[PDB]
Amino acid sequence: VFGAKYTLRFGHVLAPGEPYHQAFLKWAKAVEEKTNGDVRIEVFPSSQLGVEEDIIEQIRMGAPVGWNTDSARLGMYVKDIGVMNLAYFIDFMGAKTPEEAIEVLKKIKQSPTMQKWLKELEQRFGIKVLSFYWVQGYRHFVTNKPIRKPEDLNGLRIRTPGAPAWQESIRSLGAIPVAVNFGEIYTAVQTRAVDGAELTYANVYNGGLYEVLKYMSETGHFLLINFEIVSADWFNSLPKEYQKIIEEEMDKAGIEVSLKIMKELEEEYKQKCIEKGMAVIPASEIDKEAFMEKAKQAYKNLGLENALNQLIKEVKGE
SS3 per residue for the chain: CCCCCEEEEEECCCCCCCHHHHHHHHHHHHHHHHCCCCEEEEEECCCCCCCCCCHHHHHHHCCCEEEEEEHHHHCCCCHHHHHHHCCCHHHHCCCCCHHHHHHHHHHHHCCHHHHHHHHHHHHHHCEEEEEEEEEEEEEEEEECCCCCCHHHHCCCEEECCCCHHHHHHHHHHCCEEECCCHHHHHHHHHCCCCCEEEECHHHHHHCCHHHCCCEEEEEEEEEEEEEEEEEHHHHHHCCHHHHHHHHHHHHHHHHHHHHHHHHHHHHHHHHHHHHCCCEEECHHHCCHHHHHHHHHHHHHHHCCHHHHHHHHHHHCCC
Rounded CA-CA distance 110/114 in Å is 7
What amino acid is encoded at 136 in this protein?
A: Q
Rounded CA-CA distance 80/210 in Å is 36
Count Cβ neighbours within 10 Å for each residue of 211-220 and write b for 16 or more, e otherwise.
ebbebbbbbb
For the chain, the domains span 1-318
Method used to determine the 3D structure: X-ray
Resolution of the experimental model in angstroms, please?
Answer: 1.9
What are the Cα distances from residue 192, in Å, to 155, 157, 188, 216?
Answer: 14, 10, 6, 18
What are the Cα distances from residue 304, in Å, to 207, 282, 301?
Answer: 33, 30, 8
The alpha carbon of 73 is separated from its chain's Cα centroid by a whole number of angstroms, namely 10
What amino acid is encoded at 37 in this protein?
A: G
CATH number of the domain located at residue range(s) 1-318 in this protein: 3.40.190.170
Contacts of 23 (CB under 8 A, 6+ apart): 134, 253, 254, 256, 257
